[PDB]
Design a protein around this nucleic acid. Structure first.
Length: 209
DNA sequence: CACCGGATAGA
DNA sequence: CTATCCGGTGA
């Protein structure tokens, strides 16, 4: 029975709208379930792929399979916006049935790219100067990405939005697409250096209390 | 494999 | 107060 559980605690360490790493939660951290990832402060939303405010930016996101148009390339990846979906019947997921829009989190994520928001898409010159995004990789990502962890969720660090643009997805409907490049001072956790570090810090899968 | 709570933002 | 939702089940 994790399908309906809520949080026990919460991150206060830093606020809901903190951009960047949660201090002393290092790259390689593991959580069995999404609720634990919320409690860490690394990705507050329970279910949603993106955490963001549409007038400020996106703080984090999760690569979980979920969306056929995501492409995961490790040190970079193309992420899909949310929405364009009929969730009637109190559903949480479905295949695309309408065009996505530059609103809400899709818009939030756009704001992270170092370039004025633009309805047709934009790219950053100094991408590194755009706002940071904490990236979490989940195991359901592994049907198609070889970077996804075997089990649960993993903090892989800060990436940044190099570019964003709209185009039709596999479904035929418009999707918002986001190129993210890693900008983190610490090794990727699927790397030997990262695996040593994970071990060297005693990181282990965090299961529910 | 139909559909539940809960966490958040935005109105 | 209401809409959204890359989860996670019991079966």
């Amino acid at each position: 029975g994790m399908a309906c559980v809520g949080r026990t605690t919460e991150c206060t360490i830093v606020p809901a709208n903190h951009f960047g790493p949660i201090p002393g939660v290092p790259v390689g951290t593991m959580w069995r379930f999404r609720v634990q990832v919320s409690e860490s402060g690394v990705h507050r939303p329970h279910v949603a792929g993106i955490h963001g405010r549409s007038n400020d930016g996106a703080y984090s996101l999760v690569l979980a399979g979920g969306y056929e148009d995501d492409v995961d390339n490790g040190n970079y990846f193309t992420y899909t916006g949310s929405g364009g979906r009929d969730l009637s019947g109190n559903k949480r997921t479905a295949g695309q049935s309408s065009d996505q829009k530059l609103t809400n989190n899709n818009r939030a994520l756009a704001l992270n790219c170092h370039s004025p928001i633009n309805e047709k898409g934009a790219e950053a010159e100094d991408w590194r100067q755009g706002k940071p995004v904490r990236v979490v990789r989940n195991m359901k990502g592994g049907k198609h990405s070889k970077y996804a962890p075997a089990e649960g969720n993993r903090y892989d660090g800060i990436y940044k939005v190099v570019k964003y643009w709209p185009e039709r997805g596999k479904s035929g409907f418009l999707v918002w697409r986001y190129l993210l490049r890693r900008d983190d001072t610490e090794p990727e956790p699927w790397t030997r250096e990262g695996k040593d570090r994970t071990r060297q810090l005693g990181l282990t899968m965090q299961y529910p209390e």
